[PDB]
Amino acid sequence: RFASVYAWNRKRISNCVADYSVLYNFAPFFAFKCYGVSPTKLNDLCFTN
Amino acid sequence: LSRLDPPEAEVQIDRLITGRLQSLQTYVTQQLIRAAEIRASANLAATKM
Numbered sequence: 001r002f003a004s005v006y007a008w009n010r011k012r013i014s015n016c017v018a019d020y021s022v023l024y025n026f027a028p029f030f031a032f033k034c035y036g037v038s039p040t041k042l043n044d045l046c047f048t049n
Numbered sequence: 050l051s052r053l054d055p056p057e058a059e060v061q062i063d064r065l066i067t068g069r070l071q072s073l074q075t076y077v078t079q080q081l082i083r084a085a086e087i088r089a090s091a092n093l094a095a096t097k098m
């Protein structure tokens with residue numbers, strides 16, 4: 001289920017380990033464009049939300 | 050050097066180096082001006098002594 005670009009769905013993610021490799025390893029993508037952060041470094045970081 | 054990837058951190062590192070060098074050049078200039086003032090004052094004090 002994915003919402004419309006208005007009334008867009010929003011999910012807060014917390015108390016977990018973020019293996020971002022499960023995302024950019026997936027075949028369907030056109031853009032993993034990343035502002036203020038790079039795809040390779042996401043797995044080294046910690047985020048306050 | 051941990052959020053951003055090697056070649057997109059460079060223009061950032063370049064701008065940071067430029068900003069930190071422009072803040073030191075004016076400091077050295079002010080130090081030279083104050084040193085010239087102190088030298089003139091010390092020459093006057095030596096003449097008076």
